[PDB]
Design a protein around this ligand. Structure first.
Ligand SMILES: O=C([O-])CC(=O)C(=O)O
Ligand SMILES: O=C([O-])CC(=O)C(=O)O
Lengths: 434, 434
């Protein structure tokens, strides 16, 4: 395609830059490791290289240099609709370039050719007990499709070549990316919607087709597009992206890598923040404030009760971010436009005002501000996605855009297996002098 | 049980040591990161803490302070048989203590109660196409069983508590460890042995029962015990151990974590080294040396042809080890005793002599010596495990001993989510001065 040729051009430009850094600047130090960091999950260590996205603690996430407002600004929009083709965002992450309306249509056509789910994947999901958590089903659907890996075939057929490895990896990426929304939708329907299935519509973009298969009317299509774009990447240090990176560095294909990543995303400290926020808002509107939108004041002092009796406010606070998440802000902008009068949004809205002043007084948590998970669930809820456990599957579809693009580049640039060194407590104790 | 109480005692002893390092010595530097290392998969960075095992580049692996010859020396042996109870090695990795003959028998009894495979896992593996790679089937069998996670239940029921989290995680560990050999054997039989199944024998230890279900006679029982013990851990920096650690640090249960780890182990640069060795020995005996054990001399100069025409010797060279792997050596000791006259062993035997002098001349690769994978496959082959792809599944059963023990401790000591920081090539280029 044009995309594969274009991507080959970028790779040839980028390989010299990388080769130079290694040969001429390999011994330049860039960070140091303290004991607190080895025990505390490498927190803060500059140990990974990614170009797909960068998280500044302050401004937020940039995708290939662009801010979120810029990306939503410049990406080609869907005719009839407010939001960009998810396919265009994928182009941007792979190439670095904003695509023309013509280049987006080539990708969209390529996705349509590839979005059909194998029958055996459906058979597999049925064989798994229906009461299995949806993220388990999601990860197993991906895993099962490893049978179709082009990369695996390439390697196992003895044709592995340091230079052209990214090529099959890119095909696996196009294939897996085109099917994940269908997979997600199948799980939604089989678990939550009486196991009746709406077929994919070949005339629809990825986001439009997802809403279709989910059975949800406009503007859920736009909700979906936005959501997937917002959750598309957050550099390569987060557990899900880092896991895929790590697995793939052993030359496991994208099916293995992305299955592993979803095992990471299913963690309560990663993928469950969104539901645990909404539940807690719904529990609060019901109990403390009597099933009614509070006044600014009963909320203002309700936060103090939760806080100075020893409990977190969920969806405030992050292990890198120190400011408002602009992903949060973009949710807020959709919600002002589209659901100003929804009760649960109004409680999120007020929390934005009242909660940062109060987490500031305590000077306690290193991020006194909201992340995305504060705002995601209330939008889903409003459009009838009331099945909390499924929110993580949505996250998983979105995050694949960034992760799969990152895996292509990792193979493109020939990055080696990730193999750090371990140490014992005995060893750390010797170095401390004990 | 005794094991759970004993392990609670060790945890209470160990938490203070850890708490001290953090509060009193958190800023002590232990390493630095260069550009070479960020681009080259964190190679050499001391970034992980594990107490289960330590890999010295020179002496090799120690399990809880003991060398391999020590572990085989001191662990209680199976009556009738040359090798230790695998259950005892598990006790050692969890506790740090060599168990009495009486403590091994309690564990063995606890495994017997838990080793039955859920029906739905068999249903799942049947739904997956029978031509699926066995490691895909393995990882998905584990993943499917996440439905039974006690840890997940514990967390989701709102009972999470920093102090007692290891308790359900230990139950998941006992349950998953007890079933993995059954899972492996089911896959062997269903794929390779006409899908007829030998039932588990309640009178047999883990290693004996595996050989039983595999359908292989003595001394395969001892082959299995040894193999699982040798492959039980290799500190927490390797891709499979590191992946489970990483996933589990988000509080994903051991089913998710160990499933993700197997996605890593299936990588060619991790789990496929064992078959890629044997195939290459068999290809060589057949072509260059005419279907017959060479003399020392035709082999001696055959290595030079492969080497100075730009190709690796498989199963020589490792990303940490700088000497002979003592895991290799222990394979060699089994094989001298039990199969001195096997053709393929005789070629491995000679390679040990001839290949280190020659990789030394070149002073090229930082480990001019063998690892385990050089010796594993020939032993399997000799006993009729001729199905190459399955070797990695054996690895996977063995490695669980270390990894699952490591996950219990990670939760015991409350280790935080692994979230390092990413940087761009642009940023690395700024720091180099460009
Ligand atoms: O955790 C991170 O670094 C970013 C992210 O993906 C998340 O907020 O879940
Ligand atoms: O240490 C390594 O990278 C290889 C390994 O995991 C193992 O042999 O178990």
């Amino acid at each position: 395609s044009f995309l594969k040729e274009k991507l080959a051009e970028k790779i040839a430009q980028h390989r010299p830059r990388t080769t130079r850094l290694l040969k001429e600047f390999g011994n330049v130090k860039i960070d140091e490791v303290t004991i607190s960091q080895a025990i505390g999950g490498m927190r803060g260590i500059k140990s990974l290289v990614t170009d797909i996205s960068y998280l500044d603690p302050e401004e937020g996430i940039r995708f290939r240099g662009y801010t979120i407002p810029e990306v939503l600004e410049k990406l080609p929009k869907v005719p009839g609709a407010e939001m960009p083709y998810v396919e265009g965002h994928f182009y941007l992450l792979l190439t670095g370039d904003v695509p023309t309306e013509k280049e987006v249509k080539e990708v969209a056509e390529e996705f349509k050719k590839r979005r059909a789910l194998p029958e055996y994947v459906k058979d597999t999901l049925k064989a798994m007990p229906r009461d299995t958590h949806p993220m388990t089903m999601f990860a197993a659907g991906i895993l099962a499709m490893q049978r179709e890996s082009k990369f695996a075939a390439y390697y196992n057929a003895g044709k592995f070549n340091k230079n052209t490895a990214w090529e099959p990896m890119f095909e696996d990426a196009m294939d897996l990316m085109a099917k994940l929304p269908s997979l997600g939708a199948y799980i939604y329907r089989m678990k939550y919607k009486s196991d009746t299935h709406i077929p994919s519509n070949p005339d629809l973009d990825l986001g439009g087709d997802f809403a279709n298969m989910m059975g949800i009317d406009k503007p859920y299509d736009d909700v979906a597009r936005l959501y997937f774009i917002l959750h598309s990447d957050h550099e390569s240090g987060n557990v899900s992206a880092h896991t895929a990176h790590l697995v793939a560095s052993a030359l496991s294909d994208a099916y293995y890598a992305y299955s592993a990543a979803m095992c990471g995303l299913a963690g309560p400290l990663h993928g469950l923040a969104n539901q645990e926020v909404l539940k807690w808002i719904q529990e609060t509107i019901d109990k403390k404030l009597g099933g009614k939108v509070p006044t600014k004041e009963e909320l203002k002092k309700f936060v103090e009760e939760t806080l100075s009796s020893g409990q977190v406010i969920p969806g405030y606070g992050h292990a890198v971010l120190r400011k408002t998440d602009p992903r949060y802000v973009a949710q807020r902008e959709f919600a002002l436009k589209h659901m100003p009068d929804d009760p649960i949004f109004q409680v999120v809205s007020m929390l934005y005002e009242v909660v940062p002043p109060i987490l500031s007084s305590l000077g306690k948590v290193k991020d006194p501000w909201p992340n995305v998970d504060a705002h995601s669930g209330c939008i889903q809820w409003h459009y009838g996605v009331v099945e909390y456990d499924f929110y993580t599957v949505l996250f998983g579809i979105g995050r694949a855009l960034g992760v799969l693009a990152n895996l292509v580049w990792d193979r493109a640039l020939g990055y080696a297996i990730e193999r750090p060194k371990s140490v014992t407590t005995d060893m750390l104790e010797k170095w401390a002098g004990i």
